[PDB]
Design a protein around this ligand. Sequence first.
Ligand SMILES: [Cl-]
Ligand SMILES: [Cl-]
Ligand SMILES: [Cl-]
Ligand SMILES: [Cl-]
Ligand SMILES: [Cl-]
Ligand SMILES: [Cl-]
Ligand SMILES: [Cl-]
Ligand SMILES: [Cl-]
Ligand SMILES: [Cl-]
Ligand SMILES: [Cl-]
Ligand SMILES: [Cl-]
Ligand SMILES: [Cl-]
Ligand SMILES: [Cl-]
Ligand SMILES: [Cl-]
Ligand SMILES: [Mn+2]
Ligand SMILES: [Mn+2]
Ligand SMILES: [Mn+2]
Ligand SMILES: [Mn+2]
Ligand SMILES: [Zn+2]
Ligand SMILES: [Zn+2]
Ligand SMILES: [Zn+2]
Ligand SMILES: [Zn+2]
Lengths: 426, 427, 429, 429
Amino acid sequence: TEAMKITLSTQPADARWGEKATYSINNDGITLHLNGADDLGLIQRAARKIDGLGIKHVQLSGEGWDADRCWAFWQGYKAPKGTRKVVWPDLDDAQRQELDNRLMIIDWVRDTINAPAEELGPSQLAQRAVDLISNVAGDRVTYRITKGEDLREQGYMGLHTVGRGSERSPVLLALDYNPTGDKEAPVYACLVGKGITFDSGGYSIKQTAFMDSMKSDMGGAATVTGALAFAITRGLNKRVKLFLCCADNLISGNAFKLGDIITYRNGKKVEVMNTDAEGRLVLADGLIDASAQKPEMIIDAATLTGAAKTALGNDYHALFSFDDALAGRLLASAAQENEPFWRLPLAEFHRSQLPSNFAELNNTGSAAYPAGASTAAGFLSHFVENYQQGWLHIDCSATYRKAPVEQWSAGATGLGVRTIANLLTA
Amino acid sequence: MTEAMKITLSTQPADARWGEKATYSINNDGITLHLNGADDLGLIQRAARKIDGLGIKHVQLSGEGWDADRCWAFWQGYKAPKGTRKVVWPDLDDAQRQELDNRLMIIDWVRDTINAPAEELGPSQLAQRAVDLISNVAGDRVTYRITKGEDLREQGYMGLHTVGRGSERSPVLLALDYNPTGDKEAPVYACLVGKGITFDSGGYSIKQTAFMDSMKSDMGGAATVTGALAFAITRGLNKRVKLFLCCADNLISGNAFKLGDIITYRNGKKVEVMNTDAEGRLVLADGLIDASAQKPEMIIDAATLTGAAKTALGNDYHALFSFDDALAGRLLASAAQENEPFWRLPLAEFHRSQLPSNFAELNNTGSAAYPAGASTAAGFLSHFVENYQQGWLHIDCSATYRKAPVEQWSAGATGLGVRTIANLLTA
Amino acid sequence: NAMTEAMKITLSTQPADARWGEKATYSINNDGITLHLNGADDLGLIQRAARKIDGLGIKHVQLSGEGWDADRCWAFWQGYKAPKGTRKVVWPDLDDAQRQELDNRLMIIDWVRDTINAPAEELGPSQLAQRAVDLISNVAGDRVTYRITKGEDLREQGYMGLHTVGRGSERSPVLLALDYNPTGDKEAPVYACLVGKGITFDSGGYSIKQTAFMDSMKSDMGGAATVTGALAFAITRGLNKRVKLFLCCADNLISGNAFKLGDIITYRNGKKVEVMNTDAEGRLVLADGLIDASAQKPEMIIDAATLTGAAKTALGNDYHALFSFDDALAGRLLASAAQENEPFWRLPLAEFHRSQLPSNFAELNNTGSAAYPAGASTAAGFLSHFVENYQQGWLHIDCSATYRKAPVEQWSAGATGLGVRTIANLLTA
Amino acid sequence: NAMTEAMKITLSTQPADARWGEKATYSINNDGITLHLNGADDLGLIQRAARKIDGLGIKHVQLSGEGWDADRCWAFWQGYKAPKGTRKVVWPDLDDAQRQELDNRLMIIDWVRDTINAPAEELGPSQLAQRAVDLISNVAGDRVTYRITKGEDLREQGYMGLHTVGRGSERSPVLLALDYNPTGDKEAPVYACLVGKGITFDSGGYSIKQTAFMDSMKSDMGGAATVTGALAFAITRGLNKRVKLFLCCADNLISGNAFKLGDIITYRNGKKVEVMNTDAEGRLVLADGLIDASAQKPEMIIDAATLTGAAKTALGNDYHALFSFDDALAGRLLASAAQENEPFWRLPLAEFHRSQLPSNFAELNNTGSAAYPAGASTAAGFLSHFVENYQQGWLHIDCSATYRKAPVEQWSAGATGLGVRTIANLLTA
Ligand SMILES: [Cl-]
Ligand SMILES: [Cl-]
Ligand SMILES: [Cl-]
Ligand SMILES: [Cl-]
Ligand SMILES: [Cl-]
Ligand SMILES: [Cl-]
Ligand SMILES: [Cl-]
Ligand SMILES: [Cl-]
Ligand SMILES: [Cl-]
Ligand SMILES: [Cl-]
Ligand SMILES: [Cl-]
Ligand SMILES: [Cl-]
Ligand SMILES: [Cl-]
Ligand SMILES: [Cl-]
Ligand SMILES: [Mn+2]
Ligand SMILES: [Mn+2]
Ligand SMILES: [Mn+2]
Ligand SMILES: [Mn+2]
Ligand SMILES: [Zn+2]
Ligand SMILES: [Zn+2]
Ligand SMILES: [Zn+2]
Ligand SMILES: [Zn+2]
């Protein structure tokens, strides 16, 4: 397990590799050939190949290494199985401090989402979320976990109806980060995350090829939890509340059925016409709680629809909002944090593109309204009192890679944590 | 309180702008229905549906020409599961209004109970709502017995128990007894048997979402025979009739019945389960055994049993099965008097052996060689009626539910069948 | 092959001994095989016994002893006959009438079975039309005339239904217009018009079928073969009235010329049909035969077609589906089915089935919806748009009892021939 | 069942009486129908009302009273018009400028709707190319010239993309190269090149579609009709610059000559493409048009195509997908879309998309992988390999809002005509 040196050079590789070669190898170690086009993308792609060569011990040596370039290499080098060692170079304290916070919190998002569903049930997601934030938030953090029958008694009909099929009761984490300590302090932001720890699809059962990665259906919850923790390391000094709607969507003699009508505390009635469209049902409860706090902005994140992945692939997160100003601020943050986001449509006509013959709303679209991600966003707007301003919905199409690509190993990428954190501390 | 939209009747056509073919037209006074005498009940129902699609939520049935049937025809079409509708009835006479109010109360109870989501209507809720509807019109002339959960297993109701033990909501057998004379030894005139699957996922033979999304209505047979008995009583039924509802959920759990399982009934029949989604005939079997023990004059079972009957008759007719030509003819004669659609489909001695199993006397499913799903299901049920050749009617309720709205029906339950069975019991 | 020897088959109202079973349909002793009638359904029992005797490898039988009449012999042969192996049957002593009746069924009803069982390669539209002429003109003689319209001529003369369906095949579509006219008088009133679907092979078109459903689609010309045999058998029964036959013959295949979804066919009666499923081609070719049948203004029109799977889902392979608006005429066909021991069952047809095929681009669609799933009723409702006087003197037969994809208790694999006798009885009644 | 007499449609800012409600978009008294405008979106409301008025079965309307204009009349008609039935609309007393704009829309946009709604049998490659010349020649007179290359000539001259997809059909593939040159000068610089996918019927080839997804594939030539209608409308709006039109027209059918999976197509620009899905044929034909477009060295290239279902999954039928590397040009089209009241949404197109179609046997694959499931973005990435300067002056429109398989609030079934005004507006500005 001896270290392999990785150097940076602006000169191309020798003709034995080609002029376009991104990396070359000799006794002095591996050399990454930067060309100024996209050095972070090139380094991350090179790291993916170095892992593929069976090299488990590297050292970033020579000049040119900064936090962003070190992070790029790690993002691509990290893989779910195996042990990897990276000897970092001489960085100033601010550069190393930024890298350490990224390593601690963003890899926590990668590892939590990658974790098996047996290891990470609703209850484990709640307490691991408290631990991550409590470790950086000092004494300025209070929380409450409501599970099982208590969700029924308190009217959380969305989260309870979806989770009750499981032997692992559904959980609501309500975490409060309040820096001033003043219990009257105004709530600046409300983060809401979909924490479905495993999605069988319900009685609308999935096919194996589409269920084999549904341990990552809690990726929205892990991304907003990381965003809060990472924001705190960035100097967040405003009150933020975190709502994680956690549950298993399983099949039992108790699971919810098609045609069942869910009555939310805001009066909205929803006919369930597909148990696999469960993500929007649990988020609706988090959003009602989020609107009640009357925050300056509400941000909900969720691995909600496959329609977002058909529109943007795994290369961008989908951004939905009625607020043009707030959408531009998040895209500006996305650009500073070098994370991919693309705005997909959300207009008033999407709020009526979920017809039902037995209730005000349907949890699915139809053949006539097949914009799955746009209609889902339209459904969530019925649960945000002032939906036309201060609300962002993120369909996390870039959260999980079912197979290794050029720059990513398999599993969670951790994308979206820096963008949301940057918007919170802006 | 707002302004109601007047609905009047005319035997003359609309003006040259609406055209001679127009079934309705709107002037200053309100909406005018243009009758032609071919099928006024059908035309008025189709017109009411279009008046609902216009967004008009408050109507007044105005002027001459209205009676119980024309008012009922309008309501049947106007009513829909969503929204709130006010209908101001015309100045009907006592008898006409009594008959209209009996249909509103009982037949709309059949539409709402079947339209109800499975979460709000389980096996125990169905049995209880059935007792409530009948005692509301019967009073002290009705008594009943519930038998649920482990009690069914102990007492040998293996059909109903095996299908419903998968649900956390225990299966329920309701045995209601309408006895006017009170005499406990009075002869039982009719035995009604109804399939009450409050939700059908198909069991381990799981359905796809597109065919499961309306399975809250798989207890439609139970609701129809219940409404039929209630309606019969409002029509002056004065004979002893027993009602049997086999109510359960067909769900998936670690306790749910599996393919290959052999169910032994109380009459000796052994049935191999080769499709858990063919559960409706498994639960009726227990209902038909109890119905036969009463040795009644007639037995009428109703069930949303197969998609085959819907391929044969669509949602336009109910499927009638029987070995008794005289009795079948009387139900068709009742359907004609009550303006309800019924069509007879084949049931012969050879259907009784078109469910071959390698491991038991009977199979619960058919094969490629015998694809008449509705006829093979009726043939299976004949094995649980002692005198199957006489006094037994089976109804595959293909006209009970409408997955989508059509010309004369909103989405959901129609309530068809209640008047026909009620008329047959009172004839 | 070694010389096969006859196995004597006798009849007995005495049950078999205990070694076999309480109620066994047949027993085998030294002198040969004994069938054990019980008086319940002797014809059904004999046909089922015959099927089993085939499964014993016995290729040569001799019906000996008293008790054998025309029906019991025919009943036996119906079950003994199979599309593989050669079978010799020594008939018993019958009177001239009984033997002539048996010989007519053997010649015509087996022709229906063999022609339907024939591979598509051997029986194209032209072969079906010619073999139908050969059969009828072999019993009618000089009393039969016919015309054959095929290929480009169908398009030129407005037969857009049959041409559009068939132009995908290298084998041109064919329309047979045969005329059985006894008194010779060309002005004689046409008593009946038989119309038949003769799809010699149904790939389903661009709406391509699954192999499990196409592997028997050589039999999609059963209706054509059933009405042809019905006329031939009716003539041997002494049919002395004028009857015209129309066979709409074509292959439904896939080519760079095959018809497409969204195409609108304009028929001669002015009705426009949108094709929203190329596999619902049966009703497209019948519509052209039904126009010609109506034009002749006969006393009754009978049409046969292996049209829908909906009829097989409703009646199985055990009954032919009967569709009509005429209660009196449907009653007579069921009355005929009883005298000929053939299974028919009436399925619904009402004025509302005529509007259960909506289209966004044309008056009629060739397929039903999710809201109107009675495939056999909507198909009959589609055909009613091509019979000028559809409420009187018209019967549609969805031939669900024509073909058996697999052997059963009383039938081998392949065509059954059922329907030939019932139509014949109604024509000669 | 004759044509009825005119029913009057008046506009009003006063709401409906309580019987209808106060949120009712329309009411009906003895005088006729009244539309209740509120000012939120009167064009949307009027169009949705027209759709409901057609649903009542009213075939003859007369827009009367004050308040009507070209946009409000056009809104009413956009919703009233349907492919089925006969409708008549008496227009109100507009001024010449308003009536000239309405007449230009009725002529050119309803042509785009009627041409796309037409059955594949009526509109093959040659018919599409010819109707396209007829429409533009009607408004352009002698300022229009054109060139048609078809059948074996496309193979000879190296249009391997368009020829390989269309050769499976009996109807030969056709490339229309139309030139609108107002100044006459033959050396005039080409301002714009329009390219249109003109697949007159998409069976999907050997990668055959199911009936449910093919029943509307007569509309797979929507791109061609849209850019064609756009050039015609642009001329009525005073277009005074040279614009070339390229329509890659073909049938994607099955035959013994149809193209096969694994087949490598060599384009005139040297690019090799491995076909791994014959249903991704739209991009193979556009590639040939885009090479001709680039060769003209134009200021801008606009291509339109009903290319992928991924755009319909991403935007529904409510917006057209816009792809481009040119932010400024993309910004100019959305500005035109706003002025013309038409829905467009931009989807991602970046350098990494040019390598998201991997093949093991050729530089490019014509299909995407599970790893790159953004079908519309990878399709745009593929087309970019056929535009010389793909980073400047090129727009790709995935026409996800061109066809409605079923009636909705504001549209009947069939083609909408959306995209004609936007492209026309961009060309004229
Ligand atoms: Cl190189
Ligand atoms: Cl690692
Ligand atoms: Cl969802
Ligand atoms: Cl990996
Ligand atoms: Cl009446
Ligand atoms: Cl069943
Ligand atoms: Cl409804
Ligand atoms: Cl043989
Ligand atoms: Cl057909
Ligand atoms: Cl065989
Ligand atoms: Cl209102
Ligand atoms: Cl029109
Ligand atoms: Cl394509
Ligand atoms: Cl339409
Ligand atoms: Mn799901
Ligand atoms: Mn079932
Ligand atoms: Mn077919
Ligand atoms: Mn295609
Ligand atoms: Zn989910
Ligand atoms: Zn059931
Ligand atoms: Zn066919
Ligand atoms: Zn295409």
